[PDB]
Amino acid sequence: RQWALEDFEIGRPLGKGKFGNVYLAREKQSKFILALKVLFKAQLEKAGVEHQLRREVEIQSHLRHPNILRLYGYFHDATRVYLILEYAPLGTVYRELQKLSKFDEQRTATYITELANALSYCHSKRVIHRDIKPENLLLGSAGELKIADFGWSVHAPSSRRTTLCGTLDYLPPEMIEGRMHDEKVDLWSLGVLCYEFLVGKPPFEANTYQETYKRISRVEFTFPDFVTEGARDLISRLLKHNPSQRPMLREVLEHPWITANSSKP
Numbered sequence: 001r002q003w004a005l006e007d008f009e010i011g012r013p014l015g016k017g018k019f020g021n022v023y024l025a026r027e028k029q030s031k032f033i034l035a036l037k038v039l040f041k042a043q044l045e046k047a048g049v050e051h052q053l054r055r056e057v058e059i060q061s062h063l064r065h066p067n068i069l070r071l072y073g074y075f076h077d078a079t080r081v082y083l084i085l086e087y088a089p090l091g092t093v094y095r096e097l098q099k100l101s102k103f104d105e106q107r108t109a110t111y112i113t114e115l116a117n118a119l120s121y122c123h124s125k126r127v128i129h130r131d132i133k134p135e136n137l138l139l140g141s142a143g144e145l146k147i148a149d150f151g152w153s154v155h156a157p158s159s160r161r162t163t164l165c166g167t168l169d170y171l172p173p174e175m176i177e178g179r180m181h182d183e184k185v186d187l188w189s190l191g192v193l194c195y196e197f198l199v200g201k202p203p204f205e206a207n208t209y210q211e212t213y214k215r216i217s218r219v220e221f222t223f224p225d226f227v228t229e230g231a232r233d234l235i236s237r238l239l240k241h242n243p244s245q246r247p248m249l250r251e252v253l254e255h256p257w258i259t260a261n262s263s264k265p
């Protein structure tokens with residue numbers, strides 16, 4: 001809506017991404033606190049990711065859900081593109097997990113409910129996120145989960161690939177194999193997260209790319225003894241090689257382990 005860098009006072013860095021250098025900022029006239037995600041045009045051009053940036057802006061700017069981070073607008077200058085985002089004051093789920101090591105069943109079930117609700121809203125518009133990982137799950141002022149980083153988002157179904165040499169840990173077999181995929185991709189990532197929240201590490205983690213790939217394609221994971229029967233049941237339903245066999249989000253939200261442990265309403 002006609003914004004420029006001179007309209008803001010920039011503050012401390014909130015985080016770093018591959019391309020996204022994110023800062024706290026304040027709009028000079030209103031004093032409103034927000035985050036500016038800064039991207040270097042030369043790096044976007046070298047990598048050939050301009051189409052992903054267009055989808056990030058066009059998809060995220062139209063979503064309105066309390067568990068989805070708002071994108072208010074954007075602007076650019078000679079060397080950088082600036083995305084104007086809602087500021088998430090309590091940081092990332094990634095950092096919460098590094099601090100706590102693992103989450104209890106109540107916190108896990110509450111975060112899974114919030115995801116589920118955000119994804120149910122996305123999927124109602126045929127939007128699939130495809131990059132649900134803890135560094136992209138931000139926390140609002142009341143500690144509520146907010147899905148962010150819509151760079152890999154697309155309208156379903158899709159055959160487009162995600163990263164090339166980056167983390168495979170949250171991706172399903174159909175995406176790592178380059179096959180056509182849909183909304184069921186986010187259901188698989190939900191199962192990976194549920195496991196990582198309870199155990200402290202994702203289920204297919206390995207020292208190499210090929211071994212992680214092998215474990216994902218064969219769905220090779222085991223549970224430590226402390227994981228309860230209800231959590232094992234939900235995780236096992238979500239991590240099914242066949243996407244058509246993965247549950248609907250309403251079945252996740254009504255699962256007896258979720259309703260028994262989540263904080264509501």
Ligand SMILES: Nc1ncnc2c1ncn2[C@@H]1O[C@H](COP(=O)(O)OP(=O)(O)OP(=O)(O)O)[C@@H](O)[C@H]1O
Pocket residue numbers: 014015016017018019020021022035037056069085086087088089091092135136138148149150151152
């Ligand atoms: N609105 C925000 N409030 C607080 N922290 C944020 C916000 N946006 C991003 N961050 C932090 O900055 C880092 C970069 O976020 P983001 O995922 O948008 O960058 P990116 O991964 O490079 O994006 P993309 O995956 O589209 O290239 C994240 O680790 C996140 O913790």
Ligand SMILES: [Mg+2]
Pocket residue numbers: 017135136149
């Ligand atoms: Mg990110």
Ligand SMILES: [Mg+2]
Pocket residue numbers: 019020053056151
């Ligand atoms: Mg991006």
